[PDB]
Amino acid sequence: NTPLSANFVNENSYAPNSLFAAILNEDLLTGLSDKIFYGKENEFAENE
């Protein structure tokens, strides 16, 4: 029910294994900046 929640991920599929269709925010797709900036919040832990 809330985003970014899934602490467990296994591995990624060989081929498409789902149907999919979606409604998009055409405004937000127009409004978003050209360059995405990630940071240290998306890095793996530097030591154990």
Added chain:
Amino acid sequence: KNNNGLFEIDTQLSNSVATNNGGLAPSYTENRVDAWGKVEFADNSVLQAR
């Protein structure tokens, strides 16, 4: 300025609005697209031509 749901600073419009010269409202300049846009009048020779 709202851009498709996300507000971003507009530095030219900020400077345009902030240039009030101590008055209550932004300056008008004839040769500049300022907070009041830009207005060019037709020459008076438009009345004869039309």
